[PDB]
């Protein structure tokens, strides 16, 4: 709606509602600077996350459910080479 503070992703089409701004007529501040900001992020990922993902028998839900279930050795060899 009008009066909303939205962060828009052009590449994936993700709409995130940060909130409503300062207009009495939750509450956040209006952003400053450029509209189209290019930001960098610093990512951290363990070896075990890539071992779970590169094991095709289970998805990334095994990182939360905990049923990794005896990840083999050749997948670890591929991760260690890559």
């Amino acid at each position: 709606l009008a009066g909303d503070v939205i962060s828009i992703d052009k590449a994936s089409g993700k709409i995130t509602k940060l909130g409503r701004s300062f207009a009495r007529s939750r509450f956040v501040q209006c952003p400053e600077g450029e509209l189209q900001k290019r930001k960098t992020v610093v990512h951290t990922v363990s070896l075990h996350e890539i071992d779970v993902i590169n094991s095709r028998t289970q998805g990334f839900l095994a990182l939360f459910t905990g049923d990794t279930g005896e990840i083999r050795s050749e997948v670890r060899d591929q991760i260690n080479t890559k």
Binding site: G33, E34, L35, Q36
Partner: protein, 125 residues
């Protein structure tokens, strides 16, 4: 000397009214100024009149057939101030700009009547 330097060329580069290079008979006709804008309209109405007379003849090479069709690829958008790549268009006056500084010191405080000559360059008024 300098006041006669052009006049010497004037008495060297003259041609009389009984012109040597022209014919013995002249019979010079009268003509209108006939500006180039209305010539297009007369040619268009002549072609349309011949078309509706033949109807009640496919054109092959007219001035309205060699003229180029519009493009199919979408046109690139640019900032009207600097010629850079245009990211944003201001909703108050519909002029594309690049980034913040050009917006704040050009697009916002500019006088009216400048916008119509800025958009005359790409013909958007």
């Amino acid at each position: 000397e300098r006041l006669l330097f052009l006049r010497s060329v004037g008495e060297r580069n003259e041609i009389g009214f009984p012109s040597r290079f022209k014919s013995a008979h002249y019979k010079k006709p009268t003509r209108r100024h006939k500006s180039a804008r209305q010539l297009i309209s007369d040619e268009n109405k002549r072609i349309n009149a011949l078309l509706t007379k033949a109807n009640k003849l496919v054109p092959k090479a007219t001035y309205f057939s060699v003229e180029a069709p519009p493009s199919i690829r979408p046109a690139k958008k640019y900032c009207d101030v600097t010629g850079l790549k245009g990211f944003y268009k201001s909703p108050t006056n519909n002029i594309r700009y690049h980034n913040a500084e050009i917006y704040q010191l050009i697009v916002k405080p500019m006088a009216p009547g400048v916008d119509q000559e800025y958009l005359k360059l790409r013909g958007a008024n």
